Design a protein around this ligand. Structure first.
Ligand SMILES: Nc1ncnc2c1ncn2[C@@H]1O[C@H](COP(=O)(O)OP(=O)(O)O)[C@@H](O)[C@H]1O
Lengths: 408, 174
């Protein structure tokens, strides 16, 4: 769909993810290829298949984020499944087909909501005419001067201009309606009333299929958790089983959805792993084949942490500022405050368990616990979160390890 | 009754008397037999029930709304239903209708008629008016309004069913 070049894709992705340039390009080549394919002939269009990617890296460094923004940037159906979710189906559990089903139910819960956007002006234009007709019951057979039913637009234009907030005036209109009512309702009862007329079925539901088939993006987290490890054998066949079960999906097959018949042959798959225990070559042969692209993501650094704190669009720091503004409170972060927020996050991760950029959300959130509660009783003030503030609030927590395993 | 319509020098009229008769006596003496239609653009006169009118003159109006002022056509569509629609069929009358374009008669038979010179004379006194109208129109410079008037008076003088109460409706255009 999008005609963006890889370089433009990476650019657009830089607005949400710090670093991880290689993964960016990998995922960007993927999107541009979908375009590249549609520019081909009949034969070559069946042949060319998605270049599925295998992202390799430690927790919370941007694997999913990258894949999620990619999806979002191509208005494509997106689903994120955890691979081990099926390691248990040998005893019972979700069949792997559910993936394509869900990627469909959301590829629907998507086309539906985005049909309320396109049809949100129809009910408040060529449909608000409902109340105006019971306000000034049109002439006994309008005459016809292509400006005659626009003539009123005096008596008429008055009811429309006055209908800029003034309602609660009960009337009635028309299974159409008939029933007598108000306007905080005759009007809203009209909102949906006239709307379900434009949106049909065999196109809305038919297109979801179209989306999934053409632009679907499946993110399979922890793919490495279903590779073979040298501790046992019984669980290995179960693991390898999920690999075989997933095989039909990435090699090309047909799944049954209560919305139609989806074809996976062009769904883009982004698998994900850490690979500390297993190595990508532990994956079964058929899967490695279907996972042509390999890309690593680096661990994040304190500098990346500082950058993640403020650069991204709607970064947690920015969101926070916004939220406190709701309280009439002007919050401000100094470069050193942020430097210390990142610092703390890094400390805890190094001293306890490393959970990537995730740690920033909990640190930042604890740091603010106090302002967040008193926000309403501080309206009209300029609170500055500087290095001092940061230290007075997080030092004792970070310093105490056992405490951090609970509170941070 | 006598309905007289004339047209001369970018001026069209329709005139009528106001006598309604029951047997050999006068029921009413001031019946308005010439109204106006289509946002006072189209004039009309008629012979029949006060209601038949009000139903045939309302319908006509809408037909004009369905044919952008184009008289004739609306008239064509009117005379149409008027001889087709089960109900509308019982209505009896003679609509005289004239706009800046043309002027014509309509009969329950569905006929749409454009007389020789937009000269119309329907009703029992019809021909006496036609005669006087034709005379004046061919031997004097009098105005369309003056014509219909005098023609009408002549009529009411000859016609036992026509009186001297008038109702004139003009129209200028050039
Ligand atoms: N490189 C990065 N740039 C911006 N945000 C990041 C980055 N890495 C992690 N994060 C933040 O941390 C969370 C971790 O999830 P995610 O980024 O999907 O990585 P992972 O798939 O390894 O868990 C996300 O909510 C994201 O906002």
């Amino acid at each position: 769909h999008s005609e963006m070049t890889p370089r433009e894709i990476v650019s657009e992705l830089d607005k949400h993810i710090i670093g991880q340039d290689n993964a960016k390009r990998s995922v960007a080549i993927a999107l541009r290829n979908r375009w590249r394919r549609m520019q081909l002939n009949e034969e070559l269009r069946h042949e060319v298949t998605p270049k599925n990617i295998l992202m390799i890296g430690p927790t919370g460094v941007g694997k999913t984020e990258i894949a999620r923004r990619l999806a979002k940037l191509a208005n494509a159906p997106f689903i994120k499944v955890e691979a081990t979710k099926f390691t248990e189906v040998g005893y019972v559990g979700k069949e792997v087909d559910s993936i394509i089903r869900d990627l469909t139910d959301a590829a629907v819960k998507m086309v539906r909501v985005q049909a309320i956007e396109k049809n949100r002006y129809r009910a408040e234009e060529l449909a608000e005419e409902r109340i105006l007709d019971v306000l000034i019951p049109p002439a006994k057979n309008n005459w016809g001067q292509t400006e005659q039913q626009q003539e009123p637009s005096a008596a008429r234009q008055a009811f429309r201009k006055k209908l800029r907030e003034g309602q609660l005036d009960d009337k009635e209109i028309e299974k159409q309606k008939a029933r007598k009512l108000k306007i905080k309702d005759a009007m809203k009862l009209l909102i949906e009333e006239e709307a379900a007329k434009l949106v049909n079925p065999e196109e809305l539901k038919q297109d979801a299929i179209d989306a999934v088939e053409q632009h679907g993006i499946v993110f399979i987290d922890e793919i490495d958790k279903i590779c073979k490890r040298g501790e046992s054998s019984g669980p290995d066949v179960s693991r390898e089983g999920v690999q075989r079960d997933l095989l039909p999906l990435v090699e090309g097959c047909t799944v049954s959805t209560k919305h139609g018949m989806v074809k996976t042959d062009h769904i883009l798959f982004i698998a994900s792993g850490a690979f500390q225990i297993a190595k990508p070559s532990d994956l079964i042969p058929e899967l490695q084949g279907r996972l042509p692209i390999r890309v690593e993501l680096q661990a994040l650094t304190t500098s990346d942490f500082e950058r993640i704190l403020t650069e991204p669009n709607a970064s947690i720091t920015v969101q926070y500022k916004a939220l406190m503004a709701t309280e009439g409170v002007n919050i401000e972060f100094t470069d050193s405050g942020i430097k210390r927020i990142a610092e703390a996050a890094w400390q805890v991760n190094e001293s306890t368990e490393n959970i990537g950029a995730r740690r920033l959300h909990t640190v930042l959130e604890r740091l603010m616990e106090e302002i967040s509660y008193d926000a309403s009783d501080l309206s009209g003030q300029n609170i500055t979160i500087d290095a001092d503030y940061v230290s007075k609030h997080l030092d004792a927590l970070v310093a105490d390890e056992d405490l951090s395993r609970f509170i941070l | 009754t006598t309905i007289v319509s004339v047209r001369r020098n970018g001026h069209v009229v329709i005139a009528g008397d106001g006598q309604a008769t029951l047997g050999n006596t006068v029921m009413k003496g001031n019946v308005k037999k010439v109204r106006r239609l289509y946002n006072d653009k189209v004039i009309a006169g008629f012979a029949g029930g006060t209601a038949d009118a009000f139903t045939l003159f309302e319908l006509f109006e809408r037909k004009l709304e369905m044919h952008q002022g184009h008289l004739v056509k609306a008239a064509v569509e009117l005379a149409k239903d008027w001889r087709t629609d089960r109900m509308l069929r019982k209505l009896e009358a003679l609509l005289a209708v004239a706009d800046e374009t043309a002027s014509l008669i309509i009969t329950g038979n569905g006929d749409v008629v454009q007389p020789e010179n937009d000269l119309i004379a329907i009703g029992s006194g019809g021909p006496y008016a036609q005669a006087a109208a034709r005379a004046l129109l061919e031997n004097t410079e009098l105005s369309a309004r003056e014509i219909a008037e005098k023609a009408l008076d002549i009529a009411g003088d000859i016609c036992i069913y026509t009186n001297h109460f008038h109702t004139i409706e003009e129209l200028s255009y050039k």
